[PDB]
Design a binder for this molecule. Structure first.
Ligand SMILES: *[C@@H]1O[C@H](CO)[C@@H](O[C@@H]2O[C@H](CO)[C@@H](O)[C@H](O)[C@H]2NC(C)=O)[C@H](O)[C@H]1NC(C)=O
Ligand SMILES: *[C@@H]1O[C@H](CO)[C@@H](O[C@@H]2O[C@H](CO)[C@@H](O)[C@H](O)[C@H]2NC(C)=O)[C@H](O)[C@H]1NC(C)=O
Ligand SMILES: *[C@@H]1O[C@H](CO)[C@@H](O[C@@H]2O[C@H](CO)[C@@H](O)[C@H](O)[C@H]2NC(C)=O)[C@H](O)[C@H]1NC(C)=O
Ligand SMILES: *[C@@H]1O[C@H](CO)[C@@H](O[C@@H]2O[C@H](CO)[C@@H](O)[C@H](O)[C@H]2NC(C)=O)[C@H](O)[C@H]1NC(C)=O
Ligand SMILES: *[C@@H]1O[C@H](CO)[C@@H](O[C@@H]2O[C@H](CO)[C@@H](O)[C@H](O)[C@H]2NC(C)=O)[C@H](O)[C@H]1NC(C)=O
Ligand SMILES: *[C@@H]1O[C@H](CO)[C@@H](O)[C@H](O)[C@H]1NC(C)=O
Ligand SMILES: *[C@@H]1O[C@H](CO)[C@@H](O)[C@H](O)[C@H]1NC(C)=O
Lengths: 50, 49, 170, 50, 99
């Protein structure tokens, strides 16, 4: 299929109306970030020649 | 699949090590990939090559 | 297509696999880059059909309905100004969908302020949004309201100068 | 077949046809000795970085 | 930068060769329509909110903070005066209470 980008929302814009929140949600989200790799060392002489 | 970013780094490093170990099995056009076989089969003028 | 060459190439091992895997990683990294840049909203917003924004003109940045590509005039000018085993993979997002994403971002930031980036899109009049932005940089709301015609005229003139400068600089 | 390593007893159940064993690198890891037919494991001698 | 929504605080967590951030954010919810005005015209003077925004539920005008609905009576304590009513486009007529 041809992928949809999002649900379509039409914002009810007018020149004298505003939307004010009356409530709130405390939302906790995860963010995973890599920091380091495995520290590898290769003996070049032993790898090439043994 | 929540922790895919760390597992991607771990898999890439392990795959690079596995490829580097696997590359010893290739002879690269020589008669054998084992150095001891070449040193025990050939005179040093052609074993050098 | 030389079979003797491939038989000799098999002696070198998995070099070709490493090159193909590196190029595959680059190819998926480009799509990930486009996904991180443009797909920052999951709601496709539209502007209202009446463009009454208190004198502010966005026609040079809103999509043109007369064009089949649904691009803005500025985006259309930007797209006009850019001119053996090899394959070119197409990008995952087409230019029409990237233009749709930018249109959604423009509609969100025009009709809803910065509220759509932090949650649900809360509508607000544009001369009020502008006043809020004025207060963010430490200028009182009254200054914006009293001089709203001059600020709208300056904004429209600057947008036109942007289009002229892009059309006049190679 | 030449190489260097420590030869130790093993618990690898080799099948009758099977003579030697190979690791991922293709270096020999176990060998069956002639004359006595026993199966000797080949473990590389200890090494590392100073 | 620190999660989706208005960022409140964050928690770090160790991970194998990585870090996990628990971003605690504030998300607005249950929004409601209101009729709004840029300024209040009273006694020939224009009144603008010091920190909030003028809203109307249909008959009465109030001032509330922008990110949460908390209606309060439009007074002189929460508004400031700048100019007359002839300049601001969209100014409406309402009384301004004096404490
Ligand atoms: C604020 O009012 C507008 C218009 O009165 C509401 O927008 C309508 O919402 C309904 C419900 O989905 C839609 O069927 C209409 O098409 C919308 N109209 C327009 C012009 O967009 C809006 O929902 C109201 N907001 C709240 C929070 O109640
Ligand atoms: C604001 O939202 C919270 C939930 O996010 C509402 O709390 C719920 O209220 C209903 C009915 O009062 C209860 O059945 C739920 O158990 C409550 N949930 C929680 C987590 O407490 C709260 O009532 C809302 N307040 C307003 C003014 O709308
Ligand atoms: C907003 O700007 C556009 C273009 O910057 C204006 O469109 C121009 O309108 C005049 C007269 O109506 C025409 O002579 C020009 O040819 C139009 N330009 C283009 C590019 O089409 C438009 O009038 C402005 N105002 C509004 C309210 O849209
Ligand atoms: C808008 O809000 C005001 C104040 O909250 C409402 O006025 C009050 O309405 C209640 C309900 O009938 C009365 O008991 C009070 O006496 C009213 N206060 C005053 C000072 O008159 C008003 O009704 C609300 N309007 C709408 C349409 O919701
Ligand atoms: C807001 O109040 C002002 C002043 O009370 C109104 O302006 C008056 O309008 C009438 C009729 O339009 C004129 O006869 C007066 O001369 C005006 N007075 C001044 C001082 O300008 C204004 O019309 C009111 N606006 C609304 C929407 O009620
Ligand atoms: C000699 O080697 C054979 C294997 O070919 C084995 O069967 C036999 O037992 C060995 N004899 C001695 C004396 O080692
Ligand atoms: C909003 O638009 C209406 C027409 O739809 C107009 O009567 C009114 O004066 C406008 N208000 C402002 C503040 O521009």
């Amino acid at each position: 299929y041809t992928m949809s980008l999002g649900a379509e929302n039409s914002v009810a814009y007018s020149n004298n109306s505003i939307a004010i929140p009356t409530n709130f949600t405390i939302s906790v989200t995860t963010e995973i970030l890599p920091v380091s790799m495995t520290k590898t060392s290769v003996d070049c002489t032993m790898y090439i020649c043994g | 699949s929540a922790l895919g970013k760390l597992q991607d780094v771990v898999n890439q490093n392990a795959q690079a090590l596995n490829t580097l170990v696997k590359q010893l099995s290739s002879n690269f056009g020589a008669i054998s990939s084992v150095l001891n076989d070449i040193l025990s089969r050939l005179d040093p003028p052609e074993a050098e090559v | 297509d030389s079979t003797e060459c491939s038989n000799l190439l098999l002696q070198y091992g998995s070099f070709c696999t490493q090159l193909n895997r590196a190029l595959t990683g680059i190819a998926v990294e480009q799509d990930k880059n486009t996904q991180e840049v443009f797909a920052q909203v999951k709601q496709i917003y539209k502007t209202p059909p009446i463009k009454d924004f208190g004198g502010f003109n966005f026609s040079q940045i809103l999509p043109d309905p007369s064009k089949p590509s649904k691009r803005s005039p500025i985006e259309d000018l930007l797209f006009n100004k850019v001119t053996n085993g090899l394959t070119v993979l197409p990008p995952l997002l087409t230019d029409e969908m990237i233009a749709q994403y930018t249109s959604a971002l423009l509609a969100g930031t025009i009709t809803s302020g910065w509220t759509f980036g932090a949650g649900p899109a809360l509508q607000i009049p544009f001369p009020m949004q502008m006043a809020y932005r004025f207060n963010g940089i430490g200028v009182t709301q009254n200054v914006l309201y009293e001089n709203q015609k001059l600020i709208a005229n300056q904004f429209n003139s600057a947008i036109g100068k942007i289009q002229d400068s892009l059309s006049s600089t190679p | 077949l030449t190489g260097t390593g420590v030869l130790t007893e093993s618990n690898k159940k080799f099948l009758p046809f099977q003579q030697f064993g190979r690791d991922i690198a293709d270096t020999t890891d176990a060998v069956r000795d002639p004359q006595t037919l026993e199966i000797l494991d080949i473990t590389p001698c200890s090494f590392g970085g100073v | 930068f620190c999660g989706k929504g208005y960022h409140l605080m964050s928690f770090p967590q160790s991970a194998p060769h990585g870090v996990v951030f628990l971003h605690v954010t504030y998300v607005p919810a249950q929004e409601k329509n209101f009729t709004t005005a840029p300024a209040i015209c009273h006694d020939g003077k224009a009144h603008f909110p010091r920190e909030g925004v003028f809203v109307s539920n249909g008959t009465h005008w109030f001032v509330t903070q922008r990110n949460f609905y908390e209606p309060q009576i439009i007074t002189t304590d929460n508004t400031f005066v700048s100019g007359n009513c002839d300049v601001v486009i969209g100014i409406v007529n309402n009384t301004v209470y004096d404490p």
